[PDB]
Design a protein around this nucleic acid. Structure first.
Ligand SMILES: Nc1ccn([C@@H]2O[C@H](COP(=O)(O)OP(=O)(O)OP(=O)(O)O)[C@@H](O)[C@H]2O)c(=O)n1
Ligand SMILES: [Ca+2]
Ligand SMILES: [Ca+2]
Ligand SMILES: [Ca+2]
Length: 1085
DNA sequence: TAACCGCGTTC
DNA sequence: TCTGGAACGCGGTTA
């Protein structure tokens, strides 16, 4: 009813009251009936402020509310204010016929009498419309409304008329010309922010005309920024519960000033003031508020937020723990957190306020940090991004340390707060607010929304600003068939990966090369052109201004000629990485790839016929058994009591696929059948390049960031990764569900074209050297030391121009075989003149030379290991480590600690055999611990090394009908500590494999490690039940551990990184205590 | 055995 | 409701 506007107006009245309490009274700008000129900004009457936030709202006439957006400002005088803007929400109607739009308009004027406020004829460009490249536009009816509810009230009324679309059959209505509705699902506050070009993070003069952007102001304003971490009482071996657990202490930092509140009914002593300063750039003075009760703690917390009026509250995982814990504690205690500090949970359950953004730094880590999930806890993030190791305390030991050593518990509390404040200010604050200047979202949404949604935001701004009609969101095809088979998956062949060699490759050991002579012949033929290519395209200069071109040319010709006569050679190597820079982006731009450019047979040489690969996974069942399964389901009854037809089409196909899955598993002994079909698609080179240019803009931006190559802050590159996070999702947005611009064809052209390029690079490197590993756009390789390497052109300006022949010899061939000579661009739009030119932004980059690269080998004959290796810089430091369990989250700590200790030893020795002998000494030492059943290890160190931690993605209940060590652990954790420990997601499952039950699967022998920290009577009872050994009396873990399972695991690793690779390099087993697979035993003969 | 799955990584 | 992609290692399951 109209009550929705009453509820929403009552919310807006309490928000206004809270805003005023926090210093955000509404500012109405002074009247001026004079002209608005940007140069007159100081003359126009108004208020100037830095935009920090923005929220949609409902306002009254100053009977139903009017939609608007409050904008929250920080003024130059240190104060603050908010200012509202009113804007009628709207969406469009498209027609089937443009000669009868007025007939359509009349009908809509009557059906939506109680909804419509305005109606207007708008013209927009439709990229799906014929001859739209010659100026043709689509006519639309723009329906406007007072507030957002009346818009949704219209959409509810138009759904009947849309779903329908009687007379004598023997020889139209105004309702049947309504085609679809467009731009109906744009979030209101985004619609306003886009139409008015208003962005958080920019300065404005709020005037009665509008917001006047003040480009003179360069820096951000300085908001009051606050961060806090809460520590609570925790049941031993169990998780905390707001229902029964109190808050020990809240620790927080306002603007570099640290504060700590203690609950004196849980904290055993009044704590005196102290300081925690980890690095001198992170100063932590801390003042303590030793309050007696939790009430006095929650109230001091609330009173302090009201005092400092903070516009940014930062947390670390505060949406899941801190905020809902404080909320529940305050509700138990009669406090209403909303009336206190204006904070409350929203639909997604996160905690937000109107006057203040809540910045959970965990959301930044997960999305934009480019950190492995095994390093996304606060401890790791602090080390990698802040540069110190913070205070640590066993969570099993926080609750009792409240009484025994209170100061120690407090030292941990401040540590969490100091890390969170400075992590926010040095990383999340600059990136999020700067991203708000280009993305029409408030800080809360810019921090949390998926990168795919950030891309749609950027693309919608371009579409609106070129008057391009938005496409509706993609609707997923519920069912699709191939050759009569139900497809369970449609996809494209993506990156090309190749393991080519394993073993140890090091700059101080010679390698055997066989140099194709025909390869050097070609390289000599293309050398002159490719050499001009380096100065004029790679370096953007002129061969005439060079002074050493022929010198360098002759020097390169010699090294190649020698390697032509002297083909077979045994010399020291050149370890190199070669990668295409912004590869997938540049491939799309070079080829002018955008979803609206992919078209089928149409009148529309703007061909760009490009190839992609289609892979389909279909049920082996034919359509006839599909119908049988359907009819069988129809004869069945489903719950909500519901016939199969009463169900939604999607739900029906879920059922059909499930029963079809079981039928194929029996009758066909399979579930899916894969078939790869090569396909071709047309890419028009004259389409509106709004998508292509949006990617081009962000790519050129990241080039600048990377161009900040320093040889004192490197955080510049800490943001180039940010541009990459957006660019990568620009390639993925085309396959995203619910996308407005979708084309599998475009994503497949990008992948297949990239594979073609990387295989061309490999095809020549193999004829000139030895390629080691290849993945998507990169190639790890070793080249002879006598191959032409680095050269500097001498310019008449005294300038020096880099030249890596190995790179430019490939770049020239790329620009010779993959250049788009069909790129067309609008020269003069007034008379529609298009001009064609050749475009190729695809370039390779080089890394190295590197001291050492270690590549592991498979346990299966012939196969290699992909996406895993270790590289070392010439100074001994670790350059790259990829794939190994050391980095991965939750692996057997023994393998992680063995790998950390083993890789650095691959640098010692003066021969390939001596390297393996030194690395084997470390292997035998680890084997000694496992064969010593941990005799020289403390029981604590042994559990740490022998425990494997796994994170259950979902809840145990959703894993029904499935067996896993994580499931068995979580089930056994429930039987011992209650069903409450298995309620939240992300359950970390720490377990140990037991020897008994003998002859039993590993999954049935996963004992949770928390049982060994339990009471001695509780220990035996559950161990007995889990070993199936009633006689059990000994409980030393050394007696229960299946030392053989752990020895086989250590052995598998030794075989893949050392023994089997050594055999492929000719060396004999360097760890005979680890025996070779039988196939390798046979090969030695 | 061959086919498949969950997790967490490299692109 | 909100929601970028595919290729790959490893240790387990099932029938
Ligand atoms: N999280 C990621 C990382 C990479 N890619 C894809 O992998 C391609 C190549 O990977 P990479 O070389 O890491 O990306 P580039 O953009 O080429 O970056 P760089 O300049 O470092 O080579 C990217 O273009 C992108 O399409 C992706 O889709 N998602
Ligand atoms: Ca904490
Ligand atoms: Ca790349
Ligand atoms: Ca790179």
């Amino acid at each position: 009813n109209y009550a929705l506007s009453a509820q929403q107006l009552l919310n807006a009245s309490k928000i206004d009251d809270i805003d005023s309490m926090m210093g955000f009274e509404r500012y109405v700008p002074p009247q001026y009936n004079g002209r608005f000129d940007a140069k007159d900004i100081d003359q126009i009457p108004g208020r100037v402020g830095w935009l920090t936030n923005m929220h949609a709202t409902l306002v009254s006439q100053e009977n139903q509310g009017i939609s608007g957006v409050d904008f929250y400002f920080l003024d130059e005088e240190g104060g603050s204010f908010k200012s509202t803007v009113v804007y009628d929400p709207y969406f469009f109607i498209a027609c089937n016929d443009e000669s009868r739009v007025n007939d359509v308009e009349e009908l809509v004027k009557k059906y939506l009498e109680s909804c419509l406020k305005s109606l207007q004829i708008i013209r927009k460009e439709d990229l799906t419309m014929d001859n739209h490249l010659l100026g043709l536009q689509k006519t639309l009816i723009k329906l406007s409304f007072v507030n957002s509810n009346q818009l949704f009230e219209a959409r509810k009324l138009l759904r009947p008329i849309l779903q329908d679309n009687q007379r004598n059959i023997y020889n139209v209505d105004a309702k049947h010309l309504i085609e679809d509705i467009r731009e109906y699902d744009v979030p209101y506050h985004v619609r306003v922010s886009i139409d008015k070009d208003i962005r958080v993070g920019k300065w404005y003069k709020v005037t009665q005309q509008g917001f006047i952007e003040d480009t003179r102001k360069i820096a951000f304003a300085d908001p009051v920024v606050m961060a806090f971490d809460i520590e609570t009482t925790k049941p031993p071996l169990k998780f905390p519960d707001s229902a029964v657990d109190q808050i020990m202490m809240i620790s927080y930092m306002i603007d570099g000033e640290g504060f700590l509140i203690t609950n004196r009914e849980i904290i055993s002593e009044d704590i005196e003031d102290f300081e925690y300063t980890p690095k001198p750039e992170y100063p932590g003075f801390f003042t303590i508020f030793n309050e007696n009760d939790e009430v006095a703690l929650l109230q001091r917390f609330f009173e302090h937020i009201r005092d400092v009026r903070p516009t940014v509250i930062s947390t670390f995982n505060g949406d899941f723990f801190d905020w809902p814990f404080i909320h529940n504690r305050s509700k138990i205690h009669g406090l209403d957190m909303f009336d206190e500090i204006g904070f409350a949970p929203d639909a997604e359950g996160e905690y937000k306020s109107s006057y203040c953004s809540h910045m959970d730094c965990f959301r930044w880590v997960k999305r934009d940090s480019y950190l492995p999930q095994g390093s996304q806890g606060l401890k790791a993030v602090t080390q990698s991004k802040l540069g110190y190791n913070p205070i640590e305390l066993d969570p099993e030991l926080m609750t009792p340390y409240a009484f025994e050593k209170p100061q120690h518990l407090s030292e941990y509390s401040v540590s969490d707060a100091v890390a969170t404040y400075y992590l926010y200010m040095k990383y999340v604050h600059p990136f999020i607010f700067s991203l708000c200047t280009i993305i029409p979202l408030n800080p809360d949404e810019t921090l949390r929304k998926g990168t795919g949604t950030l891309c749609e935001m950027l693309l919608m701004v371009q579409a609106y600003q070129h008057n391009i009609l938005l496409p509706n969101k993609h609707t997923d095809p519920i069912e699709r068939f191939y050759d009569g088979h139900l497809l369970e998956s449609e996809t494209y062949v993506g990156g090309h990966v190749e393991s080519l060699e394993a073993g140890v490759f090091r700059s101080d050991l010679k390698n055997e090369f066989k140099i194709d002579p025909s390869a050097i012949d070609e390289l000599l033929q293309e050398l002159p052109e490719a050499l001009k290519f380096s100065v004029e395209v790679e370096n953007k200069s002129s061969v005439d201004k060079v002074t050493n071109f022929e010198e360098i040319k002759n020097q390169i010709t010699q090294k190649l000629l020698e390697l032509k006569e002297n083909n077979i050679r045994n010399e020291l190597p050149l370890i190199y990485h070669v990668d295409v820079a912004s590869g997938y982006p540049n491939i799309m731009t070079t080829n002018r790839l955008q979803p609206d450019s992919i078209k089928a047979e149409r009148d529309c040489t703007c061909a760009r016929k490009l190839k992609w690969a289609w892979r389909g996974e279909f049920f082996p069942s034919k359509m006839d058994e599909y119908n049988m399964i359907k009819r069988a389901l129809q004869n069945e009854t489903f719950p909500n009591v519901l016939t199969f037809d009463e169900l939604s089409y999607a739900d029906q196909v879920i059922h059909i696929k499930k029963r079809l899955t079981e039928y194929s598993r029996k009758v066909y002994h399979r579930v899916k059948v894969s078939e790869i079909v090569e396909r071709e698609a047309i890419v028009c080179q004259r389409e509106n390049p709004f998508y292509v240019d949006t990617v081009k803009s962000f790519r050129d931006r990241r080039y600048e960031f990377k161009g900040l190559a320093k040889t004192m802050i490197v955080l510049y590159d800490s943001l180039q990764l940010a541009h990459k996070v957006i660019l990568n999702s620009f390639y993925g947005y085309v396959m995203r569900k619910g996308s407005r611009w979708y084309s599998m064809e475009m994503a497949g052209i990008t992948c297949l074209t990239g594979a073609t390029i990387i295989q061309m690079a490999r095809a020549l490197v193999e004829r000139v050297g030895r390629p080691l590993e290849l993945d998507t756009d990169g190639i790890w390789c070793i080249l002879p030391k006598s191959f032409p390497e680095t050269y500097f052109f001498t310019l008449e300006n005294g300038k020096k121009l880099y030249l890596s022949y190995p790179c430019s010899m490939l770049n020239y061939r790329v620009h010779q075989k993959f250049t788009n000579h069909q790129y067309q661009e609008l020269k003069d739009p007034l008379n529609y003149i298009y001009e064609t030119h050749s475009e190729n932004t695809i370039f390779f980059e080089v890394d190295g030379p590197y001291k050492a690269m270690i590549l592991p080998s498979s346990k299966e004959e012939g196969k290699g290991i992909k996406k895993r290796y270790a590289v070392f810089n010439e100074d001994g430091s670790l350059a790259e480590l990829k794939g190994f369990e050391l980095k991965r989250r939750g692996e057997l700590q023994l393998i992680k600690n063995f790998q950390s200790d083993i890789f650095k030893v691959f640098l010692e020795g003066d021969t390939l055999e001596g390297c393996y002998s030194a690395v084997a000494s470390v292997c035998n030492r680890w084997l000694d611990v496992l064969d010593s059943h941990g005799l020289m290890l403390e029981d604590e160190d042994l559990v740490s090394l022998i425990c494997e931690n796994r994170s259950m993605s979902k809840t145990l209940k959703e894993y029904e009908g499935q067996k896993s060590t994580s499931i068995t652990t979580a089930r056994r954790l429930g039987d011992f500590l209650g069903e409450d420990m298995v309620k939240d997601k992300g359950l970390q499952c720490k377990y140990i494999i037991s020897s008994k039950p003998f002859n039993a699967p590993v999954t049935e022998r996963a004992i949770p490690v928390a049982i060994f920290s339990a009471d001695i009577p509780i220990k035996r009872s559950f161990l007995r039940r889990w070993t199936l050994d009633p006689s059990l009396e000994d409980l030393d873990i050394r007696t229960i551990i299946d030392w053989g399972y752990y020895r086989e695991r250590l052995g598998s690793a030794i075989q893949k990184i050392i023994t089997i690779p050594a055999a492929l390099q000719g060396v004999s087993n360097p760890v005979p205590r680890v025996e070779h697979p039988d196939w390798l035993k046979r090969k030695i003969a």
